Ligand SMILES: Nc1ncnc2c1ncn2[C@@H]1O[C@H](COP(=O)(O)OP(=O)(O)OP(=O)(O)O)[C@@H](O)[C@H]1O
Ligand SMILES: [Mg+2]
């Protein structure tokens with residue numbers, strides 16, 4: 001009987017081989033890099049291709065359902081517009097270029113007069129990031145962010161690098177005037193990848209200078 | 217020097233059209249391809265009888281897309297059923313493009329011509345052939361070494377300008393320069409058309425139904441009212457009878473209007489409906505008890 | 506064999522999927538007759554489009570998102586309204602369970 005099981009194994013092995021060869025010869029290249037907007041239930045997703053055209057898919061294609069999530073950047077066929085392979089993100093390379101670790105060391109000795117503001121930032125961050133156990137125990141929710149408003153030349157960028165300097169962290173700087181790209185869906189992808197990268201790394205701070213570029 | 221005369225006609229059977237259009241529309245977003253079965257009966261016609269679809273591959277429409285094992289197995293399997301035909305050519309769809317050949321298609325046809333120098337290539341566009349018109353043009357490569365003699369090397373005949381005129385949509389992509397069209401002719405015979413007429417054939421029940429009397433009366437009343445307005449218009453136009461060049465009056469007021477077009481044609485439809493309904497009703501009162 | 510059975514059924518579903526083709530997402534803007542609509546693609550021209558037989562005429566009201574076939578240009582199925590945090594007003598703000 002073991003020979004019968006072996007024969008079934010070999011037959012289904014060559015069946016797997018032929019279906020795999022069909023899949024491989026239907027994969028080929030190129031793929032249309034498309035961004036899945038959402039996933040409707042009634043195994044079918046609404047894709048917006050990089051060609052600025054949306055195409056509903058009756059079936060998802062050569063991928064598995066729960067792996068796909070709203071916002072996933074995948075590669076689809078140029079004609080049938082069907083998901084072929086999920087494309088890894090890797091946070092591009094520009095996003096990883098903004099984790100700058102040559103912090104010019106704005107020690108609080110290099111910033112004068114902005115003392116109470118330094119202490120207010122260190123009350124809003126640092127201790128929430130460093131000594132967080134007591135912060136959970138108290139029930140004081142630490143504000144996730146601070147907005148540095150002030151007349152130009154006040155030193156907002158300086159104190160930002162300062163509290164990025166003497167308080168460790170990764171300092172993923174995400175300055176606003178950078179976050180405007182004539183390519184559609186690049187700035188938004190930049191922000192989402194920056195936050196995903198901040199999730200990936202150790203305790204860090206996302207810093208956005210001149211928010212008016214996108215904050216209008 | 218052997219030459220393909222313009223009177224050479226590639227015979228496509230009725231089954232071939234339906235299956236080729238079905239394959240084109242099934243894989244319509246992409247360019248489907250397959251191998252056509254037929255016989256080179258003589259020099260002046262190439263008869264194709266059946267066809268089978270090459271499975272779609274990511275390469276597209278090329279010599280690579282032809283799978284040797286699949287075509288061999290399909291040929292051997294079809295031989296046992298009673299179809300010992302030879303590979304006669306290949307077809308590929310051109311969704312919305314039209315009826316022409318690309319450079320890759322040019323090489324693909326060249327490779328087919330290597331096995332036999334009458335391997336025809338036809339194109340079927342499923343989108344332009346959306347109605348009674350079926351855009352399907354056959355092509356065979358003309359040899360680039362035959363520029364010394366006359367392209368389209370045909371001889372004594374009279375069917376070069378018949379059944380088609382070289383299309384502008386295909387001339388610019390190269391016609392009578394690299395590849396030349398072949399007149400299309402479809403082999404349709406009895407015992408095949410009769411089976412096909414069953415697509416919309418009605419039945420014995422149809423022709424005896426009395427429609428619906430409520431909506432029949434509503435339609436009759438609506439047509440009678442529109443006839444009353446049209447008769448008011450007819451009275452106005454006829455009683456006008458303006459004689460400042462009445463022949464020019466009959467040509468300065470032609471916009472498909474009152475006088476005759478929206479006249480008795482509407483009488484035609486209402487009278488046809490009424491007589492058909494009355495005759496059917498009387499036939500039912502006679503036959504049914 | 507059993508694990509091969511499961512992954513082979515999945516692979517056959519993938520093979521069937523490879524034949525399946527996409528539909529342009531469109532939005533109905535008018536209903537001329539009971540087989541006529543004016544559907545506008547998300548980024549594209551406006552087409553006079555019909556509806557598939559296995560589809561309710563009533564549901565396709567002005568503003569109903571649809572996914573028509575991209576070759577025959579005929580509606581195949583309805584889609585619910587698109588959802589995205591693209592709203593320009595404060596409605597998406599939650600007052601908080603206080
Ligand atoms: N409180 C301060 N202590 C020391 N140097 C300061 C202080 N405020 C500003 N500076 C200096 O003045 C300059 C101001 O540049 P910086 O970008 O740091 O300020 P900013 O107010 O954030 O600027 P902008 O609004 O134009 O972006 C820098 O060279 C900085 O070193
Ligand atoms: Mg600044």
Ligand SMILES: [Zn+2]
Nearest residue numbers: 277308318321
């Ligand atoms: Zn082609």
